[PDB]
Design a binder for this molecule. Structure first.
Ligand code: CLA
Ligand code: CLA
Ligand code: CLA
Ligand code: CLA
Ligand code: CLA
Ligand code: CLA
Ligand code: CLA
Ligand code: CLA
Ligand SMILES: CC1=C(/C=C/C(C)=C/C=CC(/C)=C/C=C/C=C(C)/C=C/C=C(C)/C=C/C2=C(C)CCCC2(C)C)C(C)(C)CCC1
Ligand SMILES: CC1=C(C/C=C(\C)CCC[C@H](C)CCC[C@H](C)CCCC(C)C)C(=O)c2ccccc2C1=O
Ligand SMILES: CC1=C(C/C=C(\C)CCC[C@H](C)CCC[C@H](C)CCCC(C)C)C(=O)c2ccccc2C1=O
Ligand code: SF4
Lengths: 42, 73, 73, 743, 73, 159, 143, 80
């Protein structure tokens, strides 16, 4: 468990998880507001 | 025209980077502090200290010629 | 078209040569003590800020120009 | 002396301690990172087991377990294939009308407007067309519904899990001992008989029961869903009796040696099936039966435990003549103590085998409705060619690694290897001369033709209408092949392939499957170009292997190791003297050779083979036979091949093939990017990184792990990797777009 | 070529070539007077750059003149 | 029994003894060629070499030349062969001038295969090489002229 | 002061089957090198030019075309087989020149009978710039 | 012949001498450090310019410097 946590935070694994989360977030934002070329709210 | 002009600016800045870096570091740097005693053009300083390929100022000019050709192209 | 391409390529070669000979001067004809604290010596002593900022400009231009081109494509 | 099962219990206990420590294998790496270079090293030596330790037993155990892991990966890949075919494919629609529907087994979710890639492939389906040729394999196997594909996918997943567990269990619970790995006689006996022979017998048994009756029903025109299930043909035997009467007697012909009675489904026809455009399945079943017999016999050669058999040492040491001293004496000990020797031999053989597979597979198509699926044919040929070339280059890499590391005349001395090392200079000099001579006469003729055409002197050109260079030998050989059936091979009705001759063009669904391929002056020139490129790459690789240990330049090159940048700027400069650098150059030359080979194949097929048949029998070829007259000059290759056929890919924007154009441009980019690494040296980059690091130090944001520039060898490796990726990917996109739009 | 392949390979190749020439009948009667050697590192870089530039210029000049003159418009 | 041996039994000289390198018939044939007739006047050896080479060169120029189809194929090819012989004579003369001096002895080896003395071949001197190259030029022009005369000037059915 | 050993012909040479990496014309017209060692017992070693050779019992003499080859062979003889060696340079005139170990003790161990050559009594960073030695035949490091 | 220089920062570690592949360097008596040793270059005519000695020097900057100079048949490492 402790060693699993340690290995699960090593550079490659942490980076892949971070970028998967970022990709999912951006994908969902684009899905809800697609084809957005300007900021119209204000 | 906007996009291509910015490509032109990129080319100018990178060629100037290569040439300015080659000039200002000609007299020596941290990797080869005594470069001034080895002349303008020389192959390298051997594979020691991690490897010193293309460490001369002549080699900086050499790498800048490619970027000049690309930018003028 | 021929004349324009002609003169632009020759101008690029001339500029690259000018920088090459600046580096050559640094190597050969530069006297650190006789140029103590003048503009040339001060250029030599903060070379790293110049090189780093020029690198930043190149990185910005390349990143964003290529990004916009690839986006449109 | 005897062959038995030997293992050791619990050599390594499964745990997570070493996961937390990056790079446990190397002591200095285990200590920690000082600079960023460390990180790269950690990956560069991940699978270099023979360097982390020196015990043969540990290396062998690691190799066995890694083999299990890779086998698990392959099984997972196959399970993914079968699942995608089962769920995200139009396999049944294609099965109902093969020539009508374009195979597809991949859809893309609609997220950022990428749904344009879900093109109209037919059969009420929208997806990405696949060129892997899986649909033809499934049709040839007798798969008719998606339930069977689902079952195969689940089974492959289970076998992937089993492979993974086997790897874990064999490395951590029961690790075979060294004498077990060194038992090569029994290994060869089992692989020849237990694996190849028995596997071929099993596949023949499947084909007799499932492939033959199912494909016969399919070709008879029965709808796929109305066909009896593959198991019924086993329960009730009259089902088989109807299609082939000889099943009525059942096995008694096989035991009374009345094998002629099995001529119904065990034939020697040859050629192609006029309906499906592939090989007769009754020929493939007989093929696999004969192969099974041959391998089951050949796997009884080497002695294991019962006296009868052959000792490989005896066979090796019994061969030697006046020209080679005591040759073959000592090779058995070399090949059973060094893994790199075996790896190099096997890599060379597998690369050659893959190349031969490509050649034979486009020669006579073995799957139904594969010949007229031009995209599939082109993609399969090109893929196998590239795989084979890479494996062959790896053969040289590992031969050089063995030469540097495991070669030792004090303890393991071989005579043939010694003589080769003693006249390497003559070998390489003559090979160099051959390379120069071939280069001048193959490419020089192209330059001559180009210059004559530019000067308006077509009468002086090396063409079919000016100065002919006819490959008389190849023409004679293929003529002898055309006349073969009924003369020299009486039992065959049709020639082995339709490329030999004899006319009998075969077409399917209005498209040309195959027809005789003519050989002319352009074929002569391109074949000599092929020979030139192969010889030059062989020169590079052989020179790297032979001069790996020492030369007249650096007499102690072995002490530096297999991989190293140089030996300084002394002696005029010793850049790229190591064997690894020779492999690095051989990669470029292999890329050149394979690119030319695939270009020749594509253009020749389009010009003289592929095309559309019409009512009167007039064949209109994709390219109107311009290869014979345009391929003899470089300008023709640049204009009539690259320029003309790039139109399909460059226009792909706005359609389902837009991804191919995107990959075309991206591959161009990556290839040009590689030149950044291939042309520069690390000194300039380190000096620049110094200024960057200073800029970071000014803001208290400098990394603790000092950022060093890439090593020299790493710079070369990155350059070659990017070069190969870019070139191969741009060719991939070009071929796929061209053949999908025009095919 | 000169930009990717480097000196050591060519030096060893030339060594074996010298052996071969010295070991053959009727041609060993002819003897070179300057010992053959591979091009220097700096010289190889310069030759590679010169080839790169000459090819660049010639191909672009051909393209530009042919395309503008082909249409004359 | 082993076929390949070190040179003269000396295993530290960069070469080997092989049937191709040193077989009775091959050794005799090579020793009986003009280049290796050490004790013969260099002019006559040059004459033989030039005759052989000039006669050799005519064929390819005549048959494969740009004017092969034209009626003047023989004349054009013979002139080209003569010109090539002239250029080869130029090359020989400059090589001899650059590689030899009047006041120096022969650079040829003075020892034979059994270790006994012998007069070094005079071909490797300045005047010896001058005589050899003059003989080669004369013989080459004569050979080109003969090959041209043998064909075209005289029918003589060949091929 | 350590009379260098004199080269002794007639000493047997190692058993070797011939190679294409041996001497060439440079040995004939310029110079070649000779290395000698003792080797207590007959054994097989790796040649610096080709394959494997066998050292004869007693003295062994081997002639090479490069000094670097002699040094590589000596290093292998010294570290692998624990053998003492010396090699010479031979000119076409018939001269022999003792080369290594120059003063009877290998160059690795300090000897009280050696003078300093090319030693600068200053740090490498205190060399004059080229401008100070311009138009003089000297180089900044030669000072 | 390449020019090899030894500078006074040398600590007499001997690592450069072990590295030279032509026996150009030596150890000589000296008194400015604990080892009473310093490197010498009495046979630079046999130097091939490999700069393998500099790769072994642990001082910063180097104490042994190789300046490539006029090339000879010995410096070019030619066996022909
Ligand atoms: C297509 C060829 C190519 C490309 C793309 C580049 C690009 C670059 N060169 Mg280079 N160069 C080239 C050829 C090329 N060069 C050749 C042939 C030579 C002759 C040897 C040189 C010699 C040279 C020198 C000497 C120098 C450069 C420098 C630079 C950088 C300048 C900074 C900049 O513009 O910001 C960025 C430009 C970009 C194009 C961005 C590239 C990264 C994009 C965003 C992709 C991101 C990755 C993406 C997520 C996909 C990842 C995939 C996954 C598998 C990892 C830049 C990255 C200078 C430098 O280092 O800058 C300080 C420098 O000094 N070049
Ligand atoms: C399932 C639990 C498990 C656990 C806890 C361990 C734990 C351990 N194993 Mg082990 N092993 C396992 C399963 C396991 N293994 C299996 C199933 C196999 C068969 C393949 C092996 C075979 C094996 C070998 C041969 C060796 C070990 C070794 C080790 C030890 C060293 C660190 C390590 O694991 O490497 C690092 C951990 C990783 C996760 C590395 C990644 C490896 C996977 C296979 C990569 C997946 C490939 C991927 C698809 C590639 C495509 C890339 C793409 C995704 C971009 C460690 C105590 C080594 C050892 O004991 O040293 C003496 C040793 O040599 N294991
Ligand atoms: C740069 C100047 C130059 C000139 C003026 C020529 C001129 C010629 N070339 Mg050449 N060529 C050149 C450069 C040149 N070339 C270069 C750089 C190359 C390398 C790419 C070639 C490659 C080349 C080839 C491969 C061939 C030619 C051929 C020819 C001839 C073809 C026309 C013909 O049939 O005439 C008349 C035809 C004749 C056979 C008469 C021969 C010419 C005279 C009579 C020979 C007398 C020579 C004289 C003794 C002087 C010796 C040379 C001396 C000045 C040192 C023509 C005389 C073709 C040819 O004719 O073959 C020889 C041919 O095959 N050229
Ligand atoms: C400098 C390069 C560059 C730039 C400036 C852009 C800019 C843009 N791209 Mg683009 N793109 C690029 C490179 C670039 N791209 C490359 C290289 C590719 C190839 C992989 C793509 C492929 C691509 C696609 C497929 C799409 C875009 C889209 C877009 C637009 C979407 C804005 C958005 O997501 O909503 C707004 C996002 C946010 C507001 C997120 C930030 C909010 C945070 C999470 C919360 C903060 C709270 C405080 C935007 C104008 C989309 C589009 O519709 O174009 C019009 C789209 O479909 N791009
Ligand atoms: C009938 C006997 C038999 C069979 C069929 C095989 C088959 C195979 N062996 Mg193997 N081997 C055998 C006997 C056999 N061996 C014996 C007696 C020895 C000792 C001398 C060895 C020692 C040996 C080594 C050292 C290696 C192999 C490897 C392999 C695989 C090669 C890669 C391949 O082609 O994948 C083909 C894939 C398939 C055919 C898929 C089905 C796989 C089935 C389930 C295999 C089951 C056979 C196995 C021997 C069953 C016994 C285990 C039992 C207790 C459950 C292959 C699956 C290599 C490997 O590890 O694989 C990557 C390898 O490194 N074998
Ligand atoms: C069954 C085939 C096989 C096997 C088992 C091996 C095994 C081995 N090889 Mg080898 N090799 C092979 C084939 C094989 N090779 C072939 C075909 C070639 C020719 C290309 C080579 C050329 C080669 C060289 C030059 C070297 C080895 C080396 C090694 C050893 C260490 C490799 C390592 O872990 O480094 C680390 C491995 C990596 C860092 C992985 C590299 C990742 C690649 C470059 C990326 C691939 C890109 C992908 C296909 C597409 C892009 C995806 C991306 C965008 C996400 C190891 C024992 C090394 C050695 O020292 O031997 C002892 C070494 O120097 N091999
Ligand atoms: C010279 C090239 C050549 C080649 C490649 C073949 C190839 C073949 N011949 Mg054939 N044959 C040839 C010359 C050739 N033949 C000549 C010159 C004659 C006399 C005119 C024959 C007469 C002949 C007959 C009568 C038959 C074949 C048959 C066959 C096929 C089965 C081979 C076989 O029986 O297994 C090997 C058999 C052995 C006994 C092993 C011995 C191998 C040899 C003798 C060594 C095979 C494709 C048989 C067939 O019909 O194919 C279906 C068959 O009936 N051939
Ligand atoms: C290797 C490629 C190659 C080849 C095979 C040819 C071949 C030919 N060219 Mg050519 N050419 C080439 C490249 C090539 N070219 C290139 C790169 C250029 C520059 C762009 C030219 C430009 C050119 C021009 C301008 C012309 C030709 C012409 C010709 C023809 C006559 C040339 C001639 O007579 O020369 C002389 C031939 C010889 C002296 C023969 C020497 C070779 C002998 C036969 C082989 C010796 C080996 C021997 C067998 C070894 C055995 C030893 C044993 C006896 C001991 C001929 C068929 C002419 C023509 O009219 O075309 C029809 C012509 O005018 N070429
Ligand atoms: C009138 C007018 C105007 C004005 C303007 C101005 C006034 C500005 C400018 C300008 C400028 C501002 C320009 C510039 C340029 C620059 C350059 C071109 C540069 C450079 C550099 C270099 C070249 C370097 C060299 C060297 C070195 C490197 C170091 C050593 C020394 C030497 C010097 C050698 C305008 C147009 C707006 C508008 C209209 C009106
Ligand atoms: C660019 C270049 C370098 C520099 C190469 C570098 C700096 C490697 C760059 C790798 C990445 C871009 C940096 C490491 C990324 C980290 C993992 C941090 C990522 C964090 C976020 C950005 C995700 C060389 O060292 C070199 C050496 C020899 C010949 C040519 C070259 C050469 O062309
Ligand atoms: C091919 C090659 C060689 C070998 C190149 C050789 C031996 C040159 C041989 C060329 C001959 C002499 C013919 C060249 C013809 C030229 C057109 C003639 C130019 C002469 C004057 C007109 C200037 C290297 O030595 C080398 C070294 C370092 C990096 C790369 C390389 C490299 O690529
Ligand atoms: S450069 Fe090489 S040969 Fe010269 S002194 Fe240094 S280590 Fe010795």
């Amino acid at each position: 468990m402790r060693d699993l946590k340690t290995y699960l935070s090593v550079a490659p694994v942490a980076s892949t998880l971070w970028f998967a989360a970022l990709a999912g977030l951006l994908i969902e934002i684009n899905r809800f507001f697609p084809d957005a070329l300007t900021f119209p709210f204000f | 025209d906007f996009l291509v002009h910015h490509a032109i600016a990129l080319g100018l800045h990178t060629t100037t980077l290569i040439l300015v870096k080659g000039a200002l570091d000609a007299r020596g740097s941290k990797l080869m502090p005594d470069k001034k005693d080895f002349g303008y053009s020389f192959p390298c300083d051997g594979p020691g200290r991690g490897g010193t390929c293309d460490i001369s100022a002549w080699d900086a000019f050499y790498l800048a010629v490619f970027w000049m050709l690309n930018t003028i192209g | 078209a021929a004349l324009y391409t002609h003169h632009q390529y020759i101008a690029g070669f001339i500029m690259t040569g000018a920088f090459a000979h600046g580096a050559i001067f640094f190597i050969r004809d530069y006297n650190p003590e006789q140029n103590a604290d003048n503009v040339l010596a001060r250029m030599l002593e903060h070379k790293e800020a110049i090189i780093s900022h020029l690198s930043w400009a190149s990185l910005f231009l390349g990143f964003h120009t290529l990004g916009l081109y690839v986006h449109n494509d | 002396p005897e062959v038995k099962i030997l293992v050791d219990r619990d050599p390594i206990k499964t745990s997570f301690e070493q996961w937390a420590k990056p790079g446990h294998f190397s002591r200095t790496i285990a200590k920690g990172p000082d600079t960023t270079t460390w990180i790269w090293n950690l990956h560069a030596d991940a699978h270099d087991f023979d360097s982390h330790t020196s015990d043969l037993e540990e290396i062998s155990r690691k190799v066995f377990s890694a083999h299990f892991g890779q086998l698990s990966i392959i099984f997972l890949w196959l399970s993914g294939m079968y699942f995608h075919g089962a769920r995200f494919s139009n396999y049944e629609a294609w099965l109902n009308d093969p020539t009508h529907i374009r195979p597809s087994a991949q859809v893309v979710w609609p997220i950022v407007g990428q749904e344009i890639l879900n093109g109209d492939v037919g059969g009420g389906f929208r997806g990405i067309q696949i060129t892997s040729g899986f649909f033809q394999i499934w049709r040839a196997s007798g798969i008719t519904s998606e339930l069977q594909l689902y079952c195969t996918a689940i089974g492959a997943l289970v076998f992937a899990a089993l492979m993974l567990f086997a790897g874990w269990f064999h490395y951590h619970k029961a690790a075979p001992k060294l004498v077990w790995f060194q038992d090569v006689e029994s290994m060869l006996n089992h692989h020849l008989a237990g694996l190849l022979g028995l596997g071929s017998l099993s596949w023949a048994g499947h084909q007799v029961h499932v492939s033959l009756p199912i494909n016969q029903f399919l070709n008879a025109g029965v709808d796929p869903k109305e066909i009896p299930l593959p198991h019924e043909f086993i329960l009730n035997r009259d089902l088989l009796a109807q299609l082939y009467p000889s099943f009525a007697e059942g096995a008694t012909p096989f035991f009374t040696l009345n094998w002629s009675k099995y001529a119904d489904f065990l034939t020697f026809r040859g050629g192609l099936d006029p309906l499906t455009g592939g090989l007769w399945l009754t020929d493939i079943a007989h093929h696999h039966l004969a192969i099974a017999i041959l391998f089951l016999i050949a796997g009884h050669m080497y002695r294991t435990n019962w006296g009868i058999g052959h000792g490989i040492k005896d066979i090796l040491e019994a061969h030697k003549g006046p020209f080679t001293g005591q040759g073959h004496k000592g090779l058995y000990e070399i090949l059973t103590t060094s893994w790199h020797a075996q790896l190099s031999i096997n890599l060379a053989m597998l690369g050659s085998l893959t190349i031969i597979v490509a050649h034979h597979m486009y020669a006579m198509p073995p799957y139904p409705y594969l010949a007229t699926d031009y995209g599939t044919q082109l993609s399969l040929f090109t893929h196998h060619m590239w795989i084979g070339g890479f494996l062959i280059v790896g053969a040289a890499a590992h031969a050089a690694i063995f030469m540097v590391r495991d070669y030792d005349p004090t303890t393991r001395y071989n005579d043939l290897l010694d003589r080769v090392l003693r006249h390497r200079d003559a070998i390489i000099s003559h090979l160099n001369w051959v390379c120069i001579f071939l280069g001048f006469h193959s490419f020089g003729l192209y330059i001559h033709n180009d210059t004559m055409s530019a000067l308006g002197r077509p009468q002086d050109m090396f063409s079919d209408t000016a100065i002919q260079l006819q490959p008389v030998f190849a023409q004679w050989i293929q003529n002898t092949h055309a006349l073969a059936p009924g003369t020299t091979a009486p039992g065959a009705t049709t020639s082995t392939s339709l490329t030999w001759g004899g006319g009998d063009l075969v077409s399917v669904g209005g498209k040309v499957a195959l027809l005789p391929i003519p050989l002319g002056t352009a074929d002569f020139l391109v074949h000599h170009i092929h020979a030139f490129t192969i010889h030059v790459t062989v020169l590079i690789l052989l020179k790297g292997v032979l001069f790996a240990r020492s030369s007249r330049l650096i007499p102690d090159k072995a002490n530096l190791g297999f991989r190293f940048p140089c030996d300084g700027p002394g002696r005029g400069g010793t850049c790229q003297v190591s064997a690894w650098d020779h492999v690095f150059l051989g990669l470029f030359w292999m890329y050149n050779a394979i690119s030319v080979v695939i270009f020749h194949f594509s253009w020749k097929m389009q010009s003289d083979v592929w095309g559309s048949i019409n009512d009167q029998g007039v064949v209109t070829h994709i390219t109107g036979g311009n290869f014979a007259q345009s391929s003899i000059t470089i300008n023709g290759w640049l204009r009539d091949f690259l320029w003309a056929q790039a139109s399909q890919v460059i226009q792909s924007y706005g359609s389902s093939l837009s991804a191919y154009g995107l990959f075309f441009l991206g591959a161009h980019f990556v290839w040009a990017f590689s030149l950044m690494f291939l042309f520069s040296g690390r000194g300039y980059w380190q000096e620049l990184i110094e200024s960057i690091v200073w800029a970071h130090n000014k803001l208290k944001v400098a990394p603790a792990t000092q950022p060093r520039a890439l090593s020299i060898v790493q710079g070369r490796a990155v350059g070659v990797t990017h070069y190969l990726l870019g070139g191969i990917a741009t060719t991939w996109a070009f071929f796929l777009a061209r053949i999908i739009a025009v095919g | 070529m000169f930009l990717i392949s480097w000196r050591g390979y060519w030096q060893e190749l030339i060594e074996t070539l010298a052996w071969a020439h010295e070991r053959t009948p009727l041609a060993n009667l002819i003897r070179w007077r300057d010992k053959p050697v591979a091009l220097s590192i700096v010289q190889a870089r310069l030759v590679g750059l010169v080839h790169f530039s000459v090819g660049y210029i010639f191909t672009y000049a051909a393209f530009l003149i042919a395309s503008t003159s082909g249409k004359f418009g | 029994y082993q076929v390949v041996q070190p040179i003269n039994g000396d295993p530290f000289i960069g070469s080997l003894e092989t049937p191709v390198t040193s077989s009775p018939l091959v050794a005799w044939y090579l020793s009986n060629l003009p280049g290796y007739r050490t004790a013969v006047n260099p002019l006559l050896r040059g004459i033989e070499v030039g005759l052989a080479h000039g006669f050799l060169l005519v064929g390819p120029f005549v048959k494969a030349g740009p004017l092969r189809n034209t009626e003047i194929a023989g004349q054009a090819g013979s002139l080209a062969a003569g010109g090539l012989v002239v250029i080869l004579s130029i090359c020989l003369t400059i090589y001899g001038i650059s590689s030899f001096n009047e006041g120096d002895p022969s650079t040829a080896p003075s020892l034979t295969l059994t270790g006994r003395k012998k007069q070094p071949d005079q071909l490797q001197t300045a005047d010896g090489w001058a005589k050899f190259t003059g003989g080669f030029f004369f013989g080459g022009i004569s050979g080109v002229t003969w090959a041209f005369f043998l064909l075209y000037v005289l029918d003589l059915p060949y091929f | 002061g350590f009379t260098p050993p004199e080269l002794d012909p007639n000493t047997p040479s190692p058993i070797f089957g011939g190679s294409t990496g041996g001497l060439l014309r440079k040995a004939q017209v310029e110079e070649f090198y000779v290395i000698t060692w003792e080797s207590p017992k007959e054994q097989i070693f790796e040649m610096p030019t080709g394959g494997a050779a066998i050292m004869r019992e007693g003295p062994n003499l081997l002639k090479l075309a490069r000094k670097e080859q002699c040094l590589a062979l000596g290093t292998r003889l010294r570290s692998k087989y624990k053998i003492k060696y010396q090699f010479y340079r031979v000119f076409p005139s018939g001269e022999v020149q003792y080369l290594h170990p120059k003063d009877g003790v290998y160059p690795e161990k300090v000897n009280p009978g050696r003078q300093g050559v090319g030693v600068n009594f200053r740090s490498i960073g205190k060399n004059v710039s080229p401008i100070e030695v311009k138009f003089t035949g000297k180089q900044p490091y030669d000072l | 012949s390449h020019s090899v220089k030894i500078y006074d920062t040398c600590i007499g570690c001997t690592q450069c001498v072990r590295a030279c592949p032509t026996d150009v360097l030596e150890m000589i008596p000296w008194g400015g450090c604990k080892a009473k040793q310093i490197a010498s270059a009495p046979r630079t005519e046999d130097c091939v310019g490999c700069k393998r000695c500099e790769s072994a020097c642990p001082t910063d900057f180097l104490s042994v410097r190789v300046y490539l100079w006029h090339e000879t048949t010995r410096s070019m490492g030619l066996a022909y």
